[PDB]
Ligand binder design. Structure first.
Ligand SMILES: O=C(NO)c1ccc2ccccc2n1
Ligand SMILES: O=C(NO)c1ccc2ccccc2n1
Lengths: 348, 348, 348, 348, 348
């Protein structure tokens, strides 16, 4: 018994769609959904999507409010659609997927993921919901997350963090670390060994190891000395070079966080979406050093040190592929006389 | 159990809101309501009102589909709101009234016209709906229409024509001539003696008397001779003068209809709404004679002849008040040497 | 080298997309595409679709400008998408299909219909384009049109008429009668025996048989006598009954055309789309007789006479299924004492 | 001599509508009002209301720039409209009331509050404006604020704080504490004894008593010991329980402010408007503990302690009504063995 | 080979327009430009301008990414248009100039500034781009910036700061201090001796002299004593008077910055654009002291002290003109008994 007024009733009374009966009066003006309170219109939702306002309002109300994988993980695993839920992409203020299964009559391609339309699509399944592990076993293509063991299925331990209502966190009162499973063409796929990005913010950056604590506290030369990083170009790659008009290196989020404590900078997110590697048009406010496309990855400093120290430094230019968030990230490694000149997530 | 999807279901299946149960998927984009049919969007409604699209869609679906008084009559009688119906104004593509009573949760000021909010408003009552004659008897302010006699109340015979789904017609299979009643502050009013406008179109004009048949079939001079209209300026007022840059007279719709058979002209409706007197910016295509504000009234030619022949012709300029469609219409009468120079429904 | 400016260049210079090189300056404001001519903006396209304005502009420019099957035929045959063309639905001012194959980067699900994404979809193939008869031979699901015989495939003779740039016509300078072929899961189907709707207009209705000429020229009683139609309720079904508030019958377009010559009426197309059976909210202007949902079919009068004369008239109410335009149309047949009371294309 | 260009002139030159003569060129595009400065358009106003852009621009320019009661107080007192002023609701970026009296020709229902249309509405009157105390005495329904004594009228001392240009403050250079008066149906109403919410922010929370200073400084167990709060469930109600997936208690703003100093959290304001009790969909970032509907009230901790300590703790579940901001707030009190389990502002 | 898809390709791959070949699929919906990434739409640009969305997207992509003069300087120098670049006004989120020269086919009035259409306009030229010094010499009207000496041209040393991608900074890795040159009617104009505004923020205010360090650190009376400012009304003008309902003085940004450290205030920017003197509707949160039009200038405190100490204090009211950012700023100086009462940038 789906309706705009019923979705609005649930939003007003339950904070989201909760299957409750009831209707509140709604008015739609342009891309905004309002409801009357004390005789005046109160905004319930502003449509920032390319879907019609009432359709986007319903998908947002029907968003998954449990800790879910971050959209970058779902994308890296090739997820096309979710089974009977909406994964809301808070970085885009829009549904992470184009279509739905058993969610909304306007976006639904099927009511159940067992319908033949879903067979070619990689359907996301949530083992925490009854019957979804079985649906993944019956699905030709899919990604499954579970909180525990699935008999006979070899697991892949995912990242410690998950997104709960747009807040990325490592759960203490809830479980955020899932087992991951993927199927392509009816065959369970072995997920590769992977590093995970840490999903931290520049403003609220917290070190997650003794090496990261030492990077933020120690001066550049004493950190590079303590961790035997001479010849690995951390001065350029991690700390950043702000002496020329073109900003040098600065590809690790921890390096940007260290710089940010001393002086501010503009980070233009010209493709605003969740991704393992981010590209920013950066402008350093103190110096005026800038770079149109500065690729940044948030790896734990220990993980980045392990990656760079595991490379052969005998060639001028070389592509280094590293698995991060289940995707293969190409890095461009530049060496001279057995030392690193630069190492960065390869542009385009 | 009112909803956007239910209103749309009724529109798709019943041609209008008919209280049926059911829901069809809807999408709202800008000011248009669509529904999915065979996987593609089909337009159900385009909002031309100043109300939110979903609210206007519901009032339009809940429009009165019986022959109703023309909006110009309701306006002339001071009608503010209708009891448990929507009078749709097809000339404005919008609800004739701002608010509703027992129609839509967004526009309702009350569910029943007996609520104290309605007491100061002139509520429209339709005696053809059960209990509405009694609701008018108990209302402080209101206008009542009936098909027959009401005990104790003296009737006012309204116009022969009514609007059925935006088509103004004199009913043959349905009754369109109503008895009108009005109450101001609990007192049944004596509605004044009135002429009625004929509500005809220029393209499909039909004569409704032997005088009108003779006006259309005879030449100007033999019609004026046959009906003894010499000195009443019908050459200017009714036939129109297209010899100068400013178009002379042409204030009776029958005169425009006669001209239209010979040659076309642009009639710019700069205030598009139903009214007893209409104002057009007219441009005659044959001559280039034009007038920014040409007031036009559609009176039966016999009624116009009666009005003009009942005037004192001894003053240069004078305001002549005529009750038409229950409202007071001011006409400007210009005379010289005991003869009419011009006579026109007053502008501003 | 697809671009908005290049599509606009083709529209301005070729009247549609013609693969020409060149760019014209464009401005997009709301849902309208403009181009600068002599320093001022000239409207090229107004988006009436639910797609983004620039995407809809490109699909419209890339529309098929050859005579194509009417959208109602494509829909009845279960067509989902077209191979390397856009079938423009002129009744909806929108693409007939959601997605494209080798047409536009925004709507394309594939570049060639041989891609596995297309295998479950019923792809439309035009045998007049090189290689499309062979692509249909190798397709799992599809509909093929040809002007002549195809080796091995038994044809279904389609309707005489086709749509050329939104004008439905029986071709004299072009071929509009196609052979139809259909495959479901790799198996060539036997298309059923079918009647075809005539796709005529009310304003420009032309009789296509001696029976239709006699229906329009003769009086009701002498036509029913000449064709031995007594007891078949043509007075109600075809001619229409305008004596009561609810308009009786009037379900054949020829009957509406005959009425239209005498007096006008409002036909409200509340679901504006191409379909075998149309539903109108009709209001007769002469009488005020009206009907919320008046189902109308344009069948050749001889075909309708054949259908009604081939029914058992011994039951009160019964569903009569008739294959029309390759689809199953349910009619409601009402009889009393061995005579027809009513017969109408079923509503909802 | 009201005009869009005159309103814009006043905004540009006076910072708001100040009755000055003059006109500046304006352009309206979509929902934004611009003015030309140095040959380019500069945004003057973005319409976030459901009123037409030019109408909302005028009401915003004509907003009251003196300290006025917070919208939650006006709503709790049943205020429908203001006399000859606009109370701007800065939390909704819109007028607090639908209609106006003597403010704008598009929204005005009357020019003076003495017009009979205003009699049923509760009109807000401002004793600081000449003749408004007299207008309240003559009004059938109304709310009056004054800075002092009104002869014969029993006052209600309002909150210490008022809103000045959207900034809630306790005035030092201006008076913000008003006397309140209310009339219903021509009869002056006795306003009840009430507590007042403190109207504080989470980010800039300041303690307003020694108890509040001790709550923020002392550890949970030593505060509960110092103030003899054992058995009153402050650990759940005020401090909050973040150990389970569902966040426990956390209904006093001071508790959220204390938590916020240690770790951040998302507070989703799903009904964004000023109200005595607010509902938030909260997500704790440290733990992942969340609650769809977490009712929060900003009471002075001493006032909340007084309310909870004045309750009978001998029943399992009970509704406790407390007057706050002149409205009756229902609280749900849950007890077991003579001790509080929970106490919260009752949902829906 | 300009196109929307090519501009979008450059934005996605280069962070701005960089003349690269390539096309990405784009969708335009309302005022937003999107591109498809991982099957979903990602916002590339939101149009906040009065230009069409696709046109504004192109001008923003073609914005100057080198340090450029702040828009207030260009405006004060009478700049109408820029030669072959777009100066993006980040305070208005729009192009600083209406038209372009050799930038975009929709906004271009010419391809080269040597075209006769540009002769009456003051064209901005950038000496850092090849051939632009020559173009300024050949231009009838223009403003030129250079990093060094132009033979025969007398320079004007501009401000130390410039805007790089919307960040105002004094360059360390880039040059931000330019030589300025202006031509009116083919004649090189002598730019006047001028002070420069410091372009600082309230939130991140940094003192740029020992006097500014002492103003922020010392108490009001000891600063006025140390710098011999008795009788110059700094208590009113710079520190601000918050004791009355109307906020007194507070016209120097440093005074607002000092106040901001102690308590917050609302600064309503009612004409949001870059200008030498800014007007704010200020509301002090601590006291409730407010002012509709509070003119604020960010001068180095030493420069303001020099200006006020260089005035004759023997007249009641007097206009003091001071050249700041190349424009003449009128100040209103009020004196009594040889002492300053007030001194402020003259309103309107
Ligand atoms: O003829 C009528 N058309 O509406 C009419 C007249 C008088 C009535 C009195 C009571 C109830 C209904 C009535 N209806
Ligand atoms: O007559 C035709 N109209 O499309 C037709 C028939 C058979 C064909 C077989 C192969 C290629 C093209 C063909 N074309």
């Amino acid at each position: 018994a789906m309706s705009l007024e019923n979705v609005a009733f649930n939003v007003v009374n339950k904070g989201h769609f909760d299957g409750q009966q009831g209707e509140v009066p709604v008015s739609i003006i342009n891309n905004t959904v309002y409801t009357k309170v004390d005789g005046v219109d109160v905004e319930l939702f502003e449509n920032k999507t390319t879907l019609p306002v009432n359709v986007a309002f319903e998908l947002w109300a029907k968003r998954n409010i449990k800790p879910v994988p971050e959209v970058k993980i779902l994308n890296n695993l090739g997820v096309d659609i979710a089974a009977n839920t909406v994964i809301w992409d808070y970085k885009r203020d829009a549904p992470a997927h184009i279509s739905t299964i058993g969610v909304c009559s306007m976006t639904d391609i099927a009511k159940k993921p067992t319908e033949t339309i879903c067979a070619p699509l990689t359907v996301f399944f949530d083992g925490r919901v009854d019957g979804q592990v079985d649906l993944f076993r019956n699905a030709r293509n899919g990604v499954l997350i579970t909180e525990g063991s699935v008999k006979g299925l070899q697991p892949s331990v995912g990242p410690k963090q998950a997104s709960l209502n747009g807040v990325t966190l490592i759960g203490e009162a809830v479980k955020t670390q899932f087992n991951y499973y993927k199927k392509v063409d009816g065959v369970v796929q072995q997920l590769p060994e992977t590093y995970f990005t840490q999903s931290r913010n520049l403003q609220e950056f917290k070190p997650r190891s003794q090496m990261e604590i030492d990077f933020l506290e120690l001066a550049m030369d004493e950190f590079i000395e303590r961790y035997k990083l001479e010849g690995y170009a951390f001065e350029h790659i991690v700390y950043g070079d702000f002496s020329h008009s073109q900003l040098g290196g600065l590809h690790l989020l921890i390096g940007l966080a260290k710089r940010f404590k001393e002086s501010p900078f503009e980070l233009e997110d010209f493709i605003p979406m969740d991704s393992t590697v981010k590209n920013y048009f950066i402008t350093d406010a103190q110096t005026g050093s800038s770079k149109c496309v500065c690729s940044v990855i948030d790896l734990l400093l220990d993980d980045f040190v392990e990656i760079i120290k595991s490379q052969d430094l005998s060639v001028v230019s070389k592509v280094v592929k590293v698995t991060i968030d289940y995707t293969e990230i190409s890095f461009m490694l530049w060496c001279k006389d057995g030392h690193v000149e630069t190492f960065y997530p390869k542009l385009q």
